[PDB]
Structures are given as structure tokens and as C-alpha cells.
Amino acid sequence: HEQTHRAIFRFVPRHEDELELEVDDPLLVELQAEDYWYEAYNMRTGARGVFPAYYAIEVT
Amino acid sequence: HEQTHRAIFRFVPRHEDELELEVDDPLLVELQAEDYWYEAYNMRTGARGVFPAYYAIEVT
Amino acid sequence: HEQTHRAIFRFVPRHEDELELEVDDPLLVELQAEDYWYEAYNMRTGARGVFPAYYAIEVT
Amino acid sequence: HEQTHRAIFRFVPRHEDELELEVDDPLLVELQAEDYWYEAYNMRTGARGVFPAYYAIEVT
């Protein structure tokens, strides 16, 4: 589908379900959990996973 | 010992080693890992654990 | 229009085009430049100007 | 002399006196102005200048 967010901080995973993030990485957020994590697809690396909500910003 | 940082965003753990954070929580960071995670002690809840570096700011 | 961000750090200008920021100041970001600066309107002081991107966070 | 801080956010100048910053750049802060700006020397690029205080953290 289409790009919803952009990563603003670098995020390096420590757990299996976490998604790696480079700054300015295009993201397609598929779910915004109630516990403040985002389930998304990294369009640069073609990878799915979760990451802390504050590491990304919407693109609008 | 003494307070080094202050949590600025709310962080809810998903993994055993992660530390829960409320906004404005006093933190005593014991280690600043090279992969961008902080090992700290939450002075409000008396709990140890790790969390994403950008969720806290130094107090000076 | 409506509030988009919130200032999180105190920012005191040094140049004519920079916008003064108090912590927790409501901001209406009108443009997110590609060089990492934000052109915004401070709803508390009714002033326009630019400031470093990391000094504000979206409100959602 | 010796390294005092580390840049944590990317900073791209807009004015002559501002100092460019890459994330994790070693900095030798020479002055901590009262208006929240830092006059420093970037040890990676060998350049002097000023930048917003919150973009760097001490190394201790």
C-alpha cells in the first residue's frame, strides 16, 4: 500500500519482533497498538516488526 | 546513587528486560550501551531494566 | 487552523527567523523543510518562525 | 583538548555561526551560553560553531 510515516531516530532491535530503523526510513504502519508500539513494514529493507511509537512521525 | 536522567515519553514494555516508564520519571542510568539502549534504575518504581535511548534526557 | 505539535525543550533564538519556544508550547507546523527545520506558528505567543526539528513532537 | 559531549540528533545549519552535526559526533564544548546554545569544536570535521544545547549530551 502507501507510506504513512518516517523514522526519525535510529532504532536497533534487541528482540525478535522488533523492526530495525535507519533515520528517514519510509514506513507503512499497519497497526497502532494501545501500549504505544507500532507494527509496521519498513519499505527500505522490506521488513515487518514493531518499534516504539515515538521513533516515527506521520507524513502530512 | 544519584539521578541522571528523566523519562520524557511513556514506555510500556513488551519484553522481560525492558523497564516501564512514566513521563517525568527519575532515572539512574547505569549503562549506555553501544546499540542505543539504556540500562537503568527507575527511582519511582524501584525497578531495573532497559529502554530505548531517546525516551530519556539528562538532567543538566 | 489546528495544533500539530508541542515544544519539548526550551529554545531561545539567536537569529531573526528563529521562533522562541517555551516547554509545552502549542505549535502549528506549516512546513517541515528537508534540512530538518520547522516553519511554525507558536499559538501561545502568536509568532511565526523556524526552529530545529527535534525540539517538538507531534500530538498523537 | 578533550571530548566533552556527543551529538545525538542531526543538525544542519541555516546560519553562518552554526556548527554542522552528524549523530554520534565527538564534540569539545568550549562554552555553555546562558541562552541555551553551545559554542563547540566538532572533532570529526574540525569545525567550530554554535548549536542548540539539547542536541548534545555529556560523555559521563
Curated annotation (Swiss-Prot), chains A, B, C, D:
Its domain of life reads Eukaryota
Give its localization: Cytoplasm; Cytoplasm, Perinuclear region; Nucleus; Endoplasmic reticulum membrane
Q: Please state every residue range assigned to the domain named SH3.
A: 1-60
Q: How does the record describe the protein's post-translational processing?
A: Phosphorylated by MAPK8, MAPK9 and MAPK10. Phosphorylated by VRK2. Hyperphosphorylated during mitosis following activation of stress-activated and MAP kinases.
Q: In which tissues is it expressed?
A: Highly expressed in brain and pancreatic beta-cells. Weaker expression found in kidney.
User: What function does the entry list?
Assistant: The JNK-interacting protein (JIP) group of scaffold proteins selectively mediates JNK signaling by aggregating specific components of the MAPK cascade to form a functional JNK signaling module. Required for JNK activation in response to excitotoxic stress. Cytoplasmic MAPK8IP1 causes inhibition of JNK-regulated activity by retaining JNK in the cytoplasm and thus inhibiting the JNK phosphorylation of c-Jun. May also participate in ApoER2-specific reelin signaling. Directly, or indirectly, regulates GLUT2 gene expression and beta-cell function.
Instruction: Let me see what the UniProt entry remarks about domains.
Output: The SH3 domain mediates homodimerization.
Q: How does it assemble?
A: Forms homo- or heterooligomeric complexes. Binds specific components of the JNK signaling pathway namely MAPK8/JNK1, MAPK9/JNK2, MAPK10/JNK3, MAP2K7/MKK7, MAP3K11/MLK3 and DLK1. Also binds the proline-rich domain-containing splice variant of apolipoprotein E receptor 2 (ApoER2). Interacts, via the PID domain, with ARHGEF28. Binds the cytoplasmic tails of LRP1 and LRP2 (Megalin). Binds the TPR motif-containing C-terminal of kinesin light chain, KLC1. Pre-assembled MAPK8IP1 scaffolding complexes are then transported as a cargo of kinesin, to the required subcellular location.
Q: Which family does it belong to?
A: Belongs to the JIP scaffold family.
Protein's name according to its UniProt entry: C-Jun-amino-terminal kinase-interacting protein 1
Native source species: Rattus norvegicus (Rat)
**Underlying gene:** Mapk8ip1
